[PDB]
Amino acid sequence: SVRFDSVGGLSNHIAALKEMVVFPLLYPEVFEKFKIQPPRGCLFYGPPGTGKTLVARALANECSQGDKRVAFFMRKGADCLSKWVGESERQLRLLFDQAYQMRPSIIFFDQIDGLAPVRSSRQDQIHSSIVSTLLALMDGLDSRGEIVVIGATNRLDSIDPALRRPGRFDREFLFSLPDKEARKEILKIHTRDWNPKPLDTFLEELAENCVGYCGADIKSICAEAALCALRRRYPQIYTTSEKLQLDLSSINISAKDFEVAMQKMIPASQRAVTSPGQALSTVVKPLLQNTVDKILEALQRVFPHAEFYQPMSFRPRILIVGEPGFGQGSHLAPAVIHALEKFTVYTLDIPVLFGVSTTSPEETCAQVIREAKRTAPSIVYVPHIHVWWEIVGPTLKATFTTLLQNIPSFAPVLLLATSDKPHSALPEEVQELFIRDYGEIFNVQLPDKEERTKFFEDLILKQAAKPPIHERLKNLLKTVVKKSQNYNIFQLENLYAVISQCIYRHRKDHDKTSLIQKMEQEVENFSCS
Amino acid sequence: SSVRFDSVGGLSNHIAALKEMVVFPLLYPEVFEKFKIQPPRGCLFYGPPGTGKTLVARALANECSQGDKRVAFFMRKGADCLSKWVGESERQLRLLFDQAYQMRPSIIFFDQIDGLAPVRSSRQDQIHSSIVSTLLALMDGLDSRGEIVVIGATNRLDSIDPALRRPGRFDREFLFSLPDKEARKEILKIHTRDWNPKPLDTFLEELAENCVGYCGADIKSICAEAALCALRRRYPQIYTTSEKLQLDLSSINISAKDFEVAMQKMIPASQRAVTSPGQALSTVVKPLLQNTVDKILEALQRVFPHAYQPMSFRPRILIVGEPGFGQGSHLAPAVIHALEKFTVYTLDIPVLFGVSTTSPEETCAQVIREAKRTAPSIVYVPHIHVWWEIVGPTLKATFTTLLQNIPSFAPVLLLATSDKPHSALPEEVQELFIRDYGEIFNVQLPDKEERTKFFEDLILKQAAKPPHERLKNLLKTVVKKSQNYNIFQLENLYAVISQCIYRHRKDHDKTSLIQKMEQEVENFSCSR
Numbered sequence A: 001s002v003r004f005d006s007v008g009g010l011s012n013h014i015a016a017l018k019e020m021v022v023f024p025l026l027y028p029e030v031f032e033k034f035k036i037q038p039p040r041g042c043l044f045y046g047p048p049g050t051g052k053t054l055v056a057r058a059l060a061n062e063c064s065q066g067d068k069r070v071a072f073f074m075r076k077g078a079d080c081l082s083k084w085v086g087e088s089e090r091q092l093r094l095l096f097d098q099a100y101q102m103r104p105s106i107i108f109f110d111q112i113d114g115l116a117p118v119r120s121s122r123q124d125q126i127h128s129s130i131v132s133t134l135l136a137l138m139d140g141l142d143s144r145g146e147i148v149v150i151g152a153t154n155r156l157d158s159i160d161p162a163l164r165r166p167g168r169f170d171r172e173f174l175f176s177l178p179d180k181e182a183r184k185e186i187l188k189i190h191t192r193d194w195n196p197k198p199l200d201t202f203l204e205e206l207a208e209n210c211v212g213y214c215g216a217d218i219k220s221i222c223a224e225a226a227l228c229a230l231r232r233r234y235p236q237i238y239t240t241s242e243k244l245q246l247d248l249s250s251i252n253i254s255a256k257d258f259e260v261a262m263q264k265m266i267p268a269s270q271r272a273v274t275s276p277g278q279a280l281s282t283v284v285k286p287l288l289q290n291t292v293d294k295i296l297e298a299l300q301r302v303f304p305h306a307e308f309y310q311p312m313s314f315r316p317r318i319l320i321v322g323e324p325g326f327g328q329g330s331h332l333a334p335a336v337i338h339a340l341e342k343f344t345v346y347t348l349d350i351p352v353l354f355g356v357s358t359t360s361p362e363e364t365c366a367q368v369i370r371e372a373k374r375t376a377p378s379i380v381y382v383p384h385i386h387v388w389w390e391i392v393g394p395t396l397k398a399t400f401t402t403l404l405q406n407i408p409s410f411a412p413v414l415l416l417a418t419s420d421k422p423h424s425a426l427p428e429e430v431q432e433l434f435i436r437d438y439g440e441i442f443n444v445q446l447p448d449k450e451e452r453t454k455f456f457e458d459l460i461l462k463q464a465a466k467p468p469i470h471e472r473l474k475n476l477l478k479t480v481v482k483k484s485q486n487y488n489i490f491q492l493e494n495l496y497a498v499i500s501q502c503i504y505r506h507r508k509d510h511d512k513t514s515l516i517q518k519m520e521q522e523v524e525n526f527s528c529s
Numbered sequence B: 001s002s003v004r005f006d007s008v009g010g011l012s013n014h015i016a017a018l019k020e021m022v023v024f025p026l027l028y029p030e031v032f033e034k035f036k037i038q039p040p041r042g043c044l045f046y047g048p049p050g051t052g053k054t055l056v057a058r059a060l061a062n063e064c065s066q067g068d069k070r071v072a073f074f075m076r077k078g079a080d081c082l083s084k085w086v087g088e089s090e091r092q093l094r095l096l097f098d099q100a101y102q103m104r105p106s107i108i109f110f111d112q113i114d115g116l117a118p119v120r121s122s123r124q125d126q127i128h129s130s131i132v133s134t135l136l137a138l139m140d141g142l143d144s145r146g147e148i149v150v151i152g153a154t155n156r157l158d159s160i161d162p163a164l165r166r167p168g169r170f171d172r173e174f175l176f177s178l179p180d181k182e183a184r185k186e187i188l189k190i191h192t193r194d195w196n197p198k199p200l201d202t203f204l205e206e207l208a209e210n211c212v213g214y215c216g217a218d219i220k221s222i223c224a225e226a227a228l229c230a231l232r233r234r235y236p237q238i239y240t241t242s243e244k245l246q247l248d249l250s251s252i253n254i255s256a257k258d259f260e261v262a263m264q265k266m267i268p269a270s271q272r273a274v275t276s277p278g279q280a281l282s283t284v285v286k287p288l289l290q291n292t293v294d295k296i297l298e299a300l301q302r303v304f305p306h307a308y309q310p311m312s313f314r315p316r317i318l319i320v321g322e323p324g325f326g327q328g329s330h331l332a333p334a335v336i337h338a339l340e341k342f343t344v345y346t347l348d349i350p351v352l353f354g355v356s357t358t359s360p361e362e363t364c365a366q367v368i369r370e371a372k373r374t375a376p377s378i379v380y381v382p383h384i385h386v387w388w389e390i391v392g393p394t395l396k397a398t399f400t401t402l403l404q405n406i407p408s409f410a411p412v413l414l415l416a417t418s419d420k421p422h423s424a425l426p427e428e429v430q431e432l433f434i435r436d437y438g439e440i441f442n443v444q445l446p447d448k449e450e451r452t453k454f455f456e457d458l459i460l461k462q463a464a465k466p467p468h469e470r471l472k473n474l475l476k477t478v479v480k481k482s483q484n485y486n487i488f489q490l491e492n493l494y495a496v497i498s499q500c501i502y503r504h505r506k507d508h509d510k511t512s513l514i515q516k517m518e519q520e521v522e523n524f525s526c527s528r
């Protein structure tokens, strides 16, 4: 029995929607003043699980409480199909007649994309007949009354193009994944009535750590965490086989109970296709945070929409370049992507172009560019452009170059790319896309001594000198940080692991100095040139 | 139910030729028996969606029903004659035709006939072939039906059984195309008739040429949306209440801001599934290239005189220039936009390959068949110096063969742009353009006057806003240093200049940003 109070973050959509079904039933003077007859159709579309059906449910439960009462008719996917010849095209006629009978009313076709395909001469004739009848009923010779029609879809572009037209489906709403702010609202909604109410700062801490969560996942963990406390509190519930009596007064949910949940479940977005955005792992942050910050500063310089009347920008492009093994293509760029949230990202990599056996690559490239143009601002991402170039045929090069030349100049679509070879060795076609004079090239340099010292500071001496369940190690740290002054990222994080293996090889020894010599031996056996 | 040939705007030929089939044989019956005519009694409307096909039938019914000469009216939906029993599918048709014959004169209106009369084939059910056979044996058979007028309407004309398209069954075919600049003013007039503060026609006239690509129903939407926007501008506390308020219907007047916002929030129904290859100059760039666009239009007026009847012979033209001068991305699309009312058929790289499930040659032939059918038109081939390198020999031969068979005097322009100068183009492309005839145009850089016009509004007016001798020095310096920059560099300089004006919004005193503007002027360097 939800009534415009279980939603969070969809405020303009609801405001526009109520203008379509509420006002003429309430203020029948302004419309008659001008002879308007407001729009009477809409189409929802967006990725799964973002609250497409809940809005319709809330609106239905809201308007049924008259006066003024409004009917409501629901239809599933393809319910009006029969094996007889003249039945499928008659149920719609019956339904529309019945709806006209009790006007005003609402007809909600649910997942219309499985009912009204694009007409073609190859598929069966029943579909063409049904779509013709459907679009003859909506706007025909005789005018329908106060019926209002709604649709749901996951793939917009597969609806017949004649249905989308002022008169039948004259407004399209985009339902997106929630941004940072809306996650807090959804969490407040789902944990409203709890006797030990959580504090809001805790909710914000949760919200800043949920990236890629879509409406139903947040609802999921709020119930996968209220069960961890139960399983911890009364561990002996699965053993017996009859109903017990409990003490439902000592099972409040602690902060820890949340953490395990975020470790176990994976968001709906990244279940069939991996996402090209990953935050820095807990070990390397004190090696690369500063470089990420500098990169974001420069991008802020050229792409002004990353600031947090409108800003004006002219074809933003940038290229992150350095010697091989400097973490440019495997640590830095995905970190930058993860830092700029609220801008959707479309990727372009060899595993993605050739990862589809049913569509040619140029089709995929065209689709990606069109989508990025549609929901701009956004990011088009292409990594390893020095290997990417000489794998693809000439047709795809020409197509890719001609598509991004048609994007309007002041439209905000960023082009982010990374490479290994220095800028001068790249093929000249790539060269005439980045204009460093304008500030579109960033060079990466190795971390300095302080930063590398911080990298090994917690390994030695805080874990090696921990009781199981103090002066030689300083010289050990000095010799370690002296030895590795010319190591790239791969070799550094290699040498981190070999020490931790010795750390783990001595769990239960209470006496040290049986491994300190082992440690200093291993560090001087390790040789990577 | 008060629409009668007076709410319909822009279609005069179709109305004029439609009343001489159903009005004249009744009213002046003494002219046709002299010659033994029996004037035509079958027509087929067709055209892209939302262009006013059902409106005409509504008007015609409403007109003929009320008057001195009464004519009946039977209406049918898509496939509303079907029944499950074997003997009833085609019996309703016979019942309807007999009933219409009994009350003659009368009219029959088949709506969405493409959903009832598919082209006969043996790859489907056989009931459809039975229905088609009884229909086309019933319209003109052995019985001479008499005074029955049959009408259809559809979007896909090519999917109708060809035995129904020949005189006797469906005589005339009517094309309903999108309105041009003049008819949009008529439609806007029609839809804003009963407004007490009547808008000035000097405002509608301006409003018309901004609505490019709109068609029919879209217009009727805008005239609605504006009103609602106006309401949002007057009583903004109305969306946050669950109880009726007291509204004063006297301060809900419509202003141009409402039209501007409502127009911005909407896209036309035509270019919603695809994108049209014609776009006007943006407001930012307009005072740099309008003169050049006018010059190009004058050359077209020289060789393509459709911009006694004018005569033309295989019109062609080629815009050429050094890279960056803006001929493939700023000039040619503007030319296509100005020459509207000429249907355009784009033909370049992402169109030929960017759609699968078809071969390049099929599309390459279809795009020219359509251009020939709807002459005059335009065939558009941008970036020829690359387009000629990415295709196989089969496509070259098919292309250079498909445009030789067009009738020599047919007015089918071929508009293309290049970047390498005409001498460096390969053979078979220098022979298609014969610049002695006047088929090559050389574009050149803008001179000083428009360059100064380009910057004065930003650096003189906008730089001094409420929330003055050094400005002239800045303007003269900027204009001077930039006497060899192409379009891309000029726009980039504009953007970097406006960035500081943005970033210093909230400081109540100037002279902190003037230094910024300076350093950006000095610290900006180009390549050339």
Ligand SMILES: Nc1ncnc2c1ncn2[C@@H]1O[C@H](COP(=O)(O)OP(=O)(O)OP(=O)(O)O)[C@@H](O)[C@H]1O
Binding pocket: A006, A007, A008, A009, A047, A048, A049, A050, A051, A052, A053, A054, A055, A153, A154, A186, A189, A214, A215, A216, A219
């Ligand atoms: N803002 C929100 N507040 C509360 N619940 C939400 C919100 N957004 C989404 N949901 C959840 O979304 C679920 C269903 O929404 P809806 O079915 O319309 O979208 P969807 O599941 O992503 O799409 P589809 O119907 O195509 O599968 C409900 O379980 C609801 O709890």
Ligand SMILES: Nc1ncnc2c1ncn2[C@@H]1O[C@H](COP(=O)(O)OP(=O)(O)OP(=O)(O)O)[C@@H](O)[C@H]1O
Binding pocket: A139, A162, A165, B007, B008, B009, B010, B047, B048, B049, B050, B051, B052, B053, B054, B055, B056, B153, B155, B187, B190, B215, B216, B217, B220
């Ligand atoms: N010239 C016009 N003046 C006013 N309204 C117009 C005009 N042309 C079209 N319309 C609008 O177009 C609407 C629909 O026209 P009509 O239904 O006959 O077109 P159609 O070809 O059948 O379109 P569809 O593809 O929707 O079937 C009318 O209700 C009217 O509001």
